Structure formats: structure tokens, C-alpha cells
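Annual report, structural modelling task.

Input specification for the potassium ion complex:
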Amino acid sequence: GDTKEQRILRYVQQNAKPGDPQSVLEAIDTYCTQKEWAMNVGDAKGQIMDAVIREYSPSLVLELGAYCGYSAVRMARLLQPGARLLTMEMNPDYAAITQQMLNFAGLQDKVTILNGASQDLIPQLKKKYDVDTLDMVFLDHWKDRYLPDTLLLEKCGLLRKGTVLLADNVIVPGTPDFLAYVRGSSSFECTHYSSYLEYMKVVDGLEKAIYQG
Ligand SMILES: [K+]
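The model returned the following structure:
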């Protein structure tokens, strides 16, 4: 335990109930808040993520970007039996911590972690990972990857009419390249979400882009 992601997991093991996803989600939040890393992700990012999942009930979700596994736990706990979450992460440390988090949550059954580059794995999804089309895409942590990844998922025919793309940390004026694309193009129907919590400043911003075929 030297890295931040290692400390998050250390804090989870020492405080969260093993096999209880909510206890885990709460432990990550409590720790990230006291150490002033992420203010209140559980109600900022979390509630938006939950609402999107309950609204669309996706059978196949692809997460592009992972750090400590919060998003993976938050998403997996709401999936239906038969539903699966494919998480792609380039960093082997972030990919490892995420696996351990899911393992601790008792959700590894519902998640498949793919350690490698999005640019290389996305074109392999159809044959190598038995994927026809994605019902949902979750874009996380790496803002400069949102646009090329979206463009790639389109090139690869992984999106269909109704595919939901949910991008995190899409806060004004950051990540404008991706925004100009989805908002601009008649191929996406967009909804922005700005979580303020009890404060007057955007704690978290999220873009929901529904593909129209
Ligand atoms: K649009």
C-alpha cells in the first residue's frame, strides 16, 4: 500500500463488509472524502450512473477506463442475471486493484476485465469477446480518449440505435472535443447532467449520448 488506489483497497478491506457491494461503495467514498481526493462521488457520479442503468437496463456494458474499481462496482451491482460488464484498462495496476475490488464485492461473476489499449481491444470485441452490439458504454477517467474511442466504437459497428454512452468528468470548459462531436452530430441525442450536491459549483458533470443509427 504505497499508491492511492492501493490505499483505497486497504481502507476497503479494513472497513467494508466482504461480499457487500454497497458497503464497499460507501468505504471508497468515505475514504476519498476524508483524504480530499473525490468529494462525494457516491451522490455525484453514483446517482447519475444508477439512474442511467435503471432506465435502460443494459445486458452488455463496456467501461472504458478504470482506476480503483468504484465505477465497476457501482455498475455491476445493478446488472440483471445474464448481463455483463466488460472493463477495459491500459494500466495494469488500476486493472489489478479493480479486479480485487470486484472480488471483495462478490461481483467478479458479472465482470470481465480486459487489460490493454482501447484502440487495440475495441476492434477485437466482436470475434474475441462474443459481442454483437453494446447496449451501454461508460467513459471514465481518461477524458482525452472519449472522442477517439467513440469514433472507434462507431467504426467497429459496436453501437446500435439506442446505445447509451455515459461520459464522466465532462465539466465545462474541459473535454470540448468529444462534446462538439456528440452534441454536433445528428447521430447522437444528448443530455448533460451537472451534480452540485449542497454546493453552488459543479462537483461532477456527465454527458449521456444516445446513438441514433
Ligand atoms: K447531437
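The radius of gyration is 16 Å.
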